[PDB]
Amino acid sequence: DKIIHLTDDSFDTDVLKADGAILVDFWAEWCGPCKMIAPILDEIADEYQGKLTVAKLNIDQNPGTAPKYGIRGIPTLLLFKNGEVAATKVGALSKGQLKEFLDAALA
Ligand SMILES: [Cu+2]
Ligand SMILES: [Cu+2]
């Protein structure tokens, strides 16, 4: 319930005008690894409450956002700070590896 489902249009407000950190998961229904990381993202959203918003963007229903960031495939994670990309990860990760990524990305 802490996870935000973005559209191409709502991205322009909820991400670009937001101070704070937002982890955006670019995914699609056909993508197996994307679906598998979904429970990890739920856990992160709870654990990082007050620190990080977790958001998802379904690239087939929202084809405009990924090209703006040069995203070539899914799953891809973009960590925004204050409306700008602050870190990226292409590919799926274990929970422990995702937390390592976040330690570095939030620093
Ligand atoms: Cu919930
Ligand atoms: Cu939930």
Numbering used by the authors: 2 to 108
From the publication, what sentences describe this entry?
The former, called EcTRX throughout this work, is a widely used experimental model for investigating the molecular basis of protein stability, folding and function.
The three-dimensional structure of this variant reveals that the hydrogen bond partner of Phe102 is now the main-chain of residue 106, through its amide nitrogen. These results are consistent with the very low effect on global stability (ΔΔG°NU = 0.3 kcal mol−1) observed for this mutation. The N106A mutant exhibits a large cavity of 166 Å2 for chain A or 130 Å2 for chain B. Electron density compatible with an ethanol molecule, used as a precipitant, was detected inside this cavity. Therefore, we speculate that this cavity of EcTRX is highly dynamic, in such a way that it connects the protein core with the bulk solvent, allowing the entrance of the ethanol molecule. For variant N106A, the drop was a 1:1 mix of protein (10 mg/ml) and reservoir solution (100 mM sodium acetate, 4 mM CuSO4, 25% ethanol, pH 4.25).
